Structure formats: C-alpha cells, structure tokens
C-alpha cells in the first residue's frame, strides 16, 4: 500500500529562463525546457509533501511510514548528491535548495513515526544536502537575495529534524540576513531590482522567512520580534502590493505583473493579524506549496508537527 518512489537521480540539470538583467522577462521556450527537466524532481516533492500532509490531516501512521520509505529510498540512491550541471545559470543549485526544503519539511512532519533504521538512512543524506547548500554561500561573490532565504529554510529544517546545532545556527543566519535586509518602507533592495516581478520577489522572499520563523517557534524561540518586528513591514508591504501595485509601479518604474499573496499568510495572520489585513488572502486558500512544506493552511491551523 506504499507506492514505489521514482528512482533518485544523483545529478540535476535545470535551466535558467530569464533573458533580461532584471530577471523579470521569461523566454517561454527556456521556461518549458526547465519545466520538463525538473518535472521528476517536482513530482517527488509534491508526493512527499502530499503524503506528509495526509499524515498531519488524519494521524494515519501508514501515510507517515510511506513518506519515510520514499525519503529513505532517495537517501540510499544518494539523490541530488552528484553534479549541479550549470547550463545558462545556477538553476541546478537553486533546485537542490528548493528540493531540500520540500524533503526536509516532509521528513520533519512525519519525524515522530521514524524508526532508528529510518533516521540513520535519512539524517546523513539531509545533513549532506544541507552542508552542500551552505558551502555555496561561503563565497562572498554569491548575491544573498531570496535564494539565500530559501537555502536557509532547508538547512534550518534539517538542523531541527536531524538535531544538528551547526545547521540550526546557519539557518538562523539566513533568516537574520533577510530580516536585516528589510528597509523602513518594508522593501528588500535586491528584490526591488526585479522590475515587473519586484512584488512577486518580495512575496517570494517573505514566504521562507515566515516558515523559518515557524520552525523556530517549534523549538520554543520567537524570531518574529527581530529588529523591532521588521518582518511586519515586508508582510504589510507585500499584502498592500497584492491589493494595489502602485507603490511598486512607482518605485521600480515597471508595471507589476498580477499577483496574489502566497501561503505565508496562513501562518502570519495568526502571529500578527494587524486588524485582519491578511484575511482576504486567507479566504483564497487553502495554500499548497511543496517547497514550503506542502499544505500551509493545514500546518498553520494544526501545527507543522502532530507532537513536539
Ligand atoms: O510558473 C510558476 O509560477 C512556477 O513557479 C515556480 O517557482 C519559481 C519561483 O516562483 C521564483 O520565481 C523562482 O525565481 C528564481 C528563478 O528560477 C531564477 O533562478 C532567477 O534567476 O532567480 C529567481 C529567484 O528566486 O530570485 O523560480 C522558481 C522556479 O521553480 O523556477 C514553481 O513553484 C513552479 O512549481 C510553478 O509552476
């Protein structure tokens, strides 16, 4: 009753799809190539997201055992521990970050049903993907925009699930840089340079900062307070933007593409409702995002974990 996982490929070969300097103008052809080259990775991500969602939703341990079996299978296969093949950019590396986020979060959701044999296979594999993602960012030439925040989520989840203190601190460092980047107007200077997609990249930067704050909460820490509730500016800026892009239209001189806020709202409204400004976005739910851990509605309402 646990279906067969797809084989785990050690190598990734994703493809960058932006043509302009502002990373805002898509080549439909290049977008399709990336979509097709990453479909297997995205299927696995959605699947372990979904089965771990199933486990949170009814507590059936079969769904948790099937999640753990899939994670174990890709760990034994050494999935994603091979070559990040550069094609026109660092997209293969970005996928290893995004995939660690999905698998680490899935693991964490079903971690209370893992047996010693399962921890021993999965933990080393998460730790290895975590330390590889981290070493990319030791190079000061690498621009620490939203990619560093998405990297941080997976490293933070791995540190929590595998009880590795170094990864926990290193994940905290990726969260802290994102918060430190929030200006008084709630903008992120590197995301302000994405022209047409500036509002999208503000929302996109925020989602993993929220989820990292939520992982801290599991451990009994409150990171939401950092730098006098700086996150609230980015949150209000983003939710303002989804309603009316005018501020973004002026500040970038580009007409923002259409945007609805992503599933961070599910968590954020509970921690800082700000007189209901995030309720309209909530009403559009439920939100499914495998790279943020899957059903953000379910996890916001009922917890990322069923037991501490
Ligand atoms: O078509 C979709 O909307 C597609 O979104 C996918 O996630 C995107 C993500 O929203 C974001 O735009 C990200 O941006 C990267 C980009 O790929 C490239 O590396 C750029 O130069 O850096 C960007 C950055 O983060 O700043 O790209 C994600 C991606 O997967 O390519 C998925 O959620 C997908 O499932 C969905 O259909």
Residue numbers in the entry: 22 to 329
Question: Could you pull the original sentences from the published paper?
Answer:
Unlike other PLs, Smlt1473 present in the clinically relevant Stenotrophomonas maltophilia strain K279a demonstrates a wide range of pH-dependent substrate specificities toward multiple, diverse polysaccharides: hyaluronic acid (pH 5.0), poly-β-D-glucuronic (celluronic) acid (pH 7.0), poly-β-D-mannuronic acid, and poly-α-L-guluronate (pH 9.0). To decode the pH-driven multiple substrate specificities and selectivity in this single enzyme, we present the X-ray structures of Smlt1473 determined at multiple pH values in apo and mannuronate-bound states as well as the tetra-hyaluronate-docked structure. We have built and refined the structures from residues A22-L330; electron density for other residues outside this range was either weak or absent. The structure is composed of 13 α-helical segments (α-1 to α-13) connected by 14 loops (L-1 to L-14) and two β-strands (β-1 and β-2) (Fig. 2, B and C (i and ii)).
The strict pH-dependent mechanism of substrate turnover further allowed us to generate arrested Michaels–Menten complexes for wild-type Smlt1473-ManA at catalytically inactive pH 5.0 and 7.0 in order to determine specific molecular interactions responsible for binding versus catalysis. In particular, we cocrystallized tetra-ManA and hexa-ManA, at pH 5.0 and 7.0, respectively; note that maximal specific activity for poly-ManA is at pH 9.0. For pH 5.0, we could have modeled the fourth sugar unit (−3 subsite), but we did not owing to real-space correlation coefficient <0.80 (∼0.72, data not shown). For the pH 5.0 cocrystallized structure, at the entry site the residues that lie in 5.0-Å vicinity of the substrates are Q52, K56, D63, R312, H221, and R218. Y222, which is the catalytic proton donor/acceptor within the active site, forms two H-bonded interactions of 2.9 and 2.7 Å, respectively, each with O2 of BEM701 and the O4 of the cleavable glycosidic bond between BEM701 and BEM601, consistent with its role in catalysis. Among these, R215 with its NH1 group forms a salt-bridge interaction of 2.9 Å with O6B of BEM601, thus complementing N167 in neutralizing the carboxylic group. Comparatively, the pH 5.0 cocrystallized ManA structure has more (11 H-bonds, three salt bridges) and shorter noncovalent interactions than pH 7.0 cocrystallized ManA structure (ten H-bonds, two salt bridges) at the [−1, +1] subsite. These observations imply that substrate binding at the [−1, +1] subsite is much tighter in terms of atomic fluctuations for the pH 5.0 bound structure.
